[PDB]
Amino acid sequence: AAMALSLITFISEHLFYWQ
């Protein structure tokens, strides 16, 4: 669940980066 937690948080900054 480490990367699974990482990938879901990977797009979290993408939301801030894209908006």
Next chain:
Amino acid sequence: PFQSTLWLLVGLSVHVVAVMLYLLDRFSPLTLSSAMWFSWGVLLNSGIGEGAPRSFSARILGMVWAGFAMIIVASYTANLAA
């Protein structure tokens, strides 16, 4: 006391997880080699340490890796106790 079955995967566990840091640095809102020393340092209780993840999410990968160091070596030096 530790069989060769667990040795191979844990030895390759650090290599396959260190690369994810630089991969995560691609879309962050320090080369690959300069980032791999961190993970091998964490496990070995070493005194050599420099450079930390810059992106917020990369710390999480470094964060969860910290717990893996404590469980293994401490419990490994508990099996020898018996």
